[PDB]
Amino acid sequence: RLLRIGNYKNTKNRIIKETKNEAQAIAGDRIRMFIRFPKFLLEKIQDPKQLLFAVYGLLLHEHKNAVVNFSLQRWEQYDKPVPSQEPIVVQYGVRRYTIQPLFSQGSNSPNNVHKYERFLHPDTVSVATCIAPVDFTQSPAIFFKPSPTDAKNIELIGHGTFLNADHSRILAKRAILTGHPFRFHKTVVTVRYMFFR
Amino acid sequence: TDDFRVLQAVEQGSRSHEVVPTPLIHQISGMRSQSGTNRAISDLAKLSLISKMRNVKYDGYRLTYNGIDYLALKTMLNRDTVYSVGNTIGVGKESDIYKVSDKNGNPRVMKIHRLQGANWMHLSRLAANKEYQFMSMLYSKGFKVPEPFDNSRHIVVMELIEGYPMRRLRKHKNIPKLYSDLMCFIVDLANSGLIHCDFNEFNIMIKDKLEDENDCGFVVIDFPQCISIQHQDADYYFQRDVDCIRRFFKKKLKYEPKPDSSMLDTEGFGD
RNA sequence: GAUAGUGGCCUACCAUGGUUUCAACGGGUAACGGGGAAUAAGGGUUCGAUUCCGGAGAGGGAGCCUGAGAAACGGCUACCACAUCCAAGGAAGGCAGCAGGCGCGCAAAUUACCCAAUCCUAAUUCAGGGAGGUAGUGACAAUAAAUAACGAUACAGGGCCCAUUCGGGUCUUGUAAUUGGAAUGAGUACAAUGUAAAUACCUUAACGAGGAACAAUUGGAGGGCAAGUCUGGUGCCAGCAGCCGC
RNA sequence: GGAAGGGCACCACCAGGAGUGGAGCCUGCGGCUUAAUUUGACGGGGAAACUCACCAGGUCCAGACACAAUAAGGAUUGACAGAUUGAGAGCUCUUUCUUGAUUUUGUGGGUGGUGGUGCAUGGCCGUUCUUAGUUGGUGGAGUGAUUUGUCUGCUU
RNA sequence: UAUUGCUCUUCAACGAGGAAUUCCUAGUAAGCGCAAGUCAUCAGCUUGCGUUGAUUACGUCCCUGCCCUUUGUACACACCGC
RNA sequence: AUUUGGACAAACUUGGUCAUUUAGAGGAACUAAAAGUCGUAACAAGGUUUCCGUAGGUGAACCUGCGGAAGGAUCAUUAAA
């Protein structure tokens, strides 16, 4: 039930062309905009000269999920580990979504088959593979972890970039079965404690 | 696909020159680095699929009989053939006969030919192609004979047939029609223009379908003995075929011919 | 005729000349010319917008008043191109001067102080000068040269002669974030000098280091070409990249 | 260099002889099967036990020293006979009792290297090239590399 | 799943054997048994011994190969179509 | 103030020509860190004195006329010393 866009870059640029075709009122104008807005959210309508109230437009089907891939580099002097399973809030575009991302290594695969890591790799850049709705701008991304203990309600895990809307990028967990070659009739070797049945 | 394709490429890197050096197997493959080529050649040499000839100032690579048939298996992966290999029934002179099976699970027959550097391989290839074309000629004329599947450059894969030789066959009920069959079939051979001089007991193979309908056939495997009628000595070859049939039917089946058997001068008004 | 004045400078009337392979004429220039600059054993090669001399121009063309001197742009007039104010009638404009802004681009400073020097102008010793000088910014280049220096100990050596052995001294190393007493400016700063007034420099009271941080970096360690026979990871972004490459 | 020429051989051919592969069986290998048909390419590998290196099971005996506890009224180690005990042998506790720190339990660097594979050193049974044409010492001539020796002939 | 030996009985394929294969020139082949090691019991296992004792070469490199050499040479790596 | 005629001469318009900044629109061709298809990929091999000028037919290629060059491997055999 995911939105499967074939090639992100060309379709992205084409939809940007469609958007520039469909620019109904250009930058530099003043608009009386009527937005569909429910009754119960009027309780957070604040004094607009007292609270900042910005309005950002969206594009076609940035609301629909895909398997999207983010870049991620660890924040500096952030030695704390984080697994591929914790909820972590991601700022991309303008939207800050709680995501449980799969941490993968971005080394190029001909068949687009990648590893699954348990944790974040402590040294290099990983890829966050996750079911999340799409961006069309390749925006900067910033990853954090909401915490009221800190001054800000934010613990900065790192930053990154909305890389791709790629669903062929799939992951695999390795399990190693290990045994000790105890005694050497040098070619035909008895190996001890690998399997038990 | 890829490793088999590169092994096909170094198979095609054999029909260029004589005994192939190391950098030609580096470059005919056209692979990335020292890794794939050198570790592949070492996997060949440790499985005895290749050998090193170091003739002064000159490294070279000598392919033995081992590292060919995989490609034939790859050639037979293309042509829907065998998946599992090995059951020894018969180690012949110019071929080694094995019982194999496909992906479909039917058992078949794998005659590998071993008849080095080019000539062992290439003469096994000529033998397999010649026997495949002779099998094609026999099946095109309509001779009851095993049906060929393929001739994977030097390994012939064909069907298995439920038969046992005539040395362990005591008799049948219709002995004079069997004599008329084994006369008229050599008549049909002379009408083909050929004489199979080794028409012995071990040649003739009988499949046995039922005991009521009597709808059976025969299998004749005499390939390095068939001689055209134009040759110097075909007269007593034909007569040896006829008379071995007759002396077997006198000794085993205790049957003497009431009609006179065909001569070569009888069959000179044939084909 | 015109001019300050010869002169096709121009005008009337005559002739039919003048230049050219010793390259005329046309074309190009990311061409202001020179004194000079960089680099070499010699001969040469390449730059010179740029501090001195000469030329030319003040958005592009043209014309002119005044005056000894201007075809003058911090003088005028008209057109062309931009552009300012406006009560819509009109009225003003030239930073390739000193500062400064936009644009442009790899590429370039303060909307500071002063006429005290050096000179210049005027009716003139006195007034005036973004000429010029001073300071800021400034790793454009250039000069000089701090980041430590002595001891004693031990310990390990080495050498000098006496060694028959010990030990008798002379050195010189290495270490030991072992110890000792010294020296001094970077920096801060009374004062004084400095200067038009200052800032800075040269002096100098009083502070100012064991310097485990008053912490020297930039590029390298296959060969060219001085420097690894070292360890770990890599070996799915990796035999790799001035050249050769393993 | 896919030139040609000689040996010189019954693991080559001709003259043949005995034959094998044809029948049955002995025996070695492969394959299948298994719980194992142990394992090599004759292995002195002739064979119910052994040899046995493989399966179905049942078992002993592990482990040093250090070190915290535990003590001779008892930690325990052994001579036992009975309850045993499944197929056999062990094993546990009731006495007759030796008991005597050999303690017992759980650990810490490793005794044990009769746990071993790699680095060096020295070296060895079968050996085998059982060296039947080559080597180098120079000469000279050629920048190097090379010529000759190592040859026209004849002969073993 | 008989170690083996003895007695009687049961009496199978097998009517000189294919494609192909091995060894060999005088007491050698071939036939024969015996003895010794494998041996607790047996050989169809290996080795020596003796009895009887052929045919046919004493030639060849024609097949099989094995070498020994001679030197035409490296296209010293060339063009291509692909 | 206005005004005649001169030389100086900025500019303006009209055409026609090159030299361009463009924008658009029309077409054509080259490529793939792109992806699948058949043709000879997964197919056989083949030519091999080499060139130079000129002319022709050609086909995936290349051959044939005419004339030059060696940038091609002189043995023997007559005489000489």
From Swiss-Prot, chain A:
<comment type="subunit">
    <text>Interacts with RIO2.</text>
</comment>
<comment type="function">
    <text>Required for 40S ribosomal subunit synthesis. Required for normal export of the pre-40S particles from the nucleus to the cytoplasm. Its subcellular location and association with pre-40S subunitshifts from mixed cytoplasm/nucleus to all nuclear in RPS19 disruptions, suggesting it acts after the ribosomal protein.</text>
</comment>
<comment type="similarity">
    <text>Belongs to the TRAFAC class translation factor GTPase superfamily. Bms1-like GTPase family. TSR1 subfamily.</text>
</comment>
<protein>
    <recommendedName>
        <fullName>Ribosome biogenesis protein TSR1</fullName>
    </recommendedName>
</protein>
Swiss-Prot record, chain B:
<comment type="function">
    <text>Required for the final endonucleolytic cleavage of 20S pre-rRNA at site D in the cytoplasm, converting it into the mature 18S rRNA. Involved in normal export of the pre-40S particles from the nucleus to the cytoplasm. No longer associates with pre-40S subunits in RPS19 disruptions, suggesting it acts after the ribosomal protein in 18S rRNA maturation.</text>
</comment>
<dbReference type="GO" id="GO:0046872">
    <property type="term" value="F:metal ion binding"/>
</dbReference>
<dbReference type="GO" id="GO:0005524">
    <property type="term" value="F:ATP binding"/>
</dbReference>
<keyword id="KW-0963">Cytoplasm</keyword>
<dbReference type="GO" id="GO:0005737">
    <property type="term" value="C:cytoplasm"/>
</dbReference>
<dbReference type="GO" id="GO:0005829">
    <property type="term" value="C:cytosol"/>
</dbReference>
<keyword id="KW-0418">Kinase</keyword>
<keyword id="KW-0723">Serine/threonine-protein kinase</keyword>
<dbReference type="GO" id="GO:0004672">
    <property type="term" value="F:protein kinase activity"/>
</dbReference>
<dbReference type="GO" id="GO:0030688">
    <property type="term" value="C:preribosome, small subunit precursor"/>
</dbReference>
<dbReference type="GO" id="GO:0000462">
    <property type="term" value="P:maturation of SSU-rRNA from tricistronic rRNA transcript (SSU-rRNA, 5.8S rRNA, LSU-rRNA)"/>
</dbReference>
<comment type="subunit">
    <text>Component of a late pre-40S ribosomal particle, composed of the 40S ribosomal proteins and the non-ribosomal factors DIM1, DIM2, ENP1, HRR25, LTV1, NOB1, RIO2 and TSR1.</text>
</comment>
<feature type="domain" description="Protein kinase">
    <location>
        <begin position="83"/>
        <end position="226"/>
    </location>
</feature>
<feature type="binding site">
    <location>
        <position position="111"/>
    </location>
    <ligand>
        <name>ATP</name>
    </ligand>
</feature>
<comment type="similarity">
    <text>Belongs to the protein kinase superfamily. RIO-type Ser/Thr kinase family.</text>
</comment>
<keyword id="KW-0460">Magnesium</keyword>
<protein>
    <recommendedName>
        <fullName>Serine/threonine-protein kinase RIO2</fullName>
        <ecNumber>2.7.11.1</ecNumber>
    </recommendedName>
</protein>
<keyword id="KW-0597">Phosphoprotein</keyword>
<dbReference type="GO" id="GO:0005634">
    <property type="term" value="C:nucleus"/>
</dbReference>
<feature type="active site" description="Proton acceptor">
    <location>
        <position position="198"/>
    </location>
</feature>
<keyword id="KW-0808">Transferase</keyword>
<keyword id="KW-0479">Metal-binding</keyword>
